[PDB]
Amino acid sequence: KAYRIKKNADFQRIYKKGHSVANRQFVVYTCNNKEIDHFRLGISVSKKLGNAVLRNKIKRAIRENFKVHKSHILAKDIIVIARQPAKDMTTLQIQNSLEHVLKIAKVFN
């Protein structure tokens, strides 16, 4: 399977059956998937935060974080949702905010 979650039906199963945590900039959902043996990541960044340039910068920051932690993440489905205050972070701060919330989410990273 690919590492990126694409289907909208997968986003819904995770929201309904999964578990969430949040800091001020990000909500994180996790949900085990016994049929997969590596993590998967879905990202949601609402148009309320800004235009496509801003949203893709946030998406790129999240993907770069999981890429660097690629080998020490547990085999769960993971959804990262950007909250409105994410639009006011520096690119550097996004990485430390993600490290904080992912540690709270028990993704082993």
Side-chain angles (χ1 to χ4, degrees), residues 1-3 5 8-15 17-33 35-108:
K1 284 274 188 181
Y3 280 82
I5 305 182
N8 178 83
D10 294 72
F11 275 78
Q12 294 300 332
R13 175 191 53 91
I14 295 169
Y15 293 155
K17 311 179 188 177
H19 302 140
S20 63
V21 298
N23 69 8
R24 288 209 332 113
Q25 293 86 26
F26 296 102
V27 179
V28 175
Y29 282 79
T30 66
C31 185
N32 295 287
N33 197 332
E35 289 161 331
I36 314 188
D37 205 359
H38 64 64
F39 73 92
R40 299 195 304 164
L41 174 66
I43 296 163
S44 173
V45 185
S46 162
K47 299 193 176 191
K48 278 189 175 291
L49 274 74
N51 66 24
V53 176
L54 180 150
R55 299 197 304 276
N56 287 341
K57 281 173 179 293
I58 295 177
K59 291 181 188 173
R60 174 166 62 99
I62 298 161
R63 296 190 179 109
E64 288 173 342
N65 187 279
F66 283 76
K67 187 184 177 179
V68 70
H69 298 305
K70 176 191 169 72
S71 64
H72 21 247
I73 290 178
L74 288 170
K76 308 165 170 290
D77 280 0
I78 303 165
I79 297 176
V80 177
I81 307 166
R83 308 183 76 183
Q84 207 68 20
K87 80 185 181 294
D88 291 309
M89 292 231 115
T90 73
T91 306
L92 284 64
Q93 287 173 332
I94 292 170
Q95 290 304 318
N96 280 331
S97 174
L98 284 168
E99 297 287 337
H100 288 142
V101 71
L102 292 178
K103 177 179 76 163
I104 293 296
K106 304 282 293 316
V107 303
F108 189 12

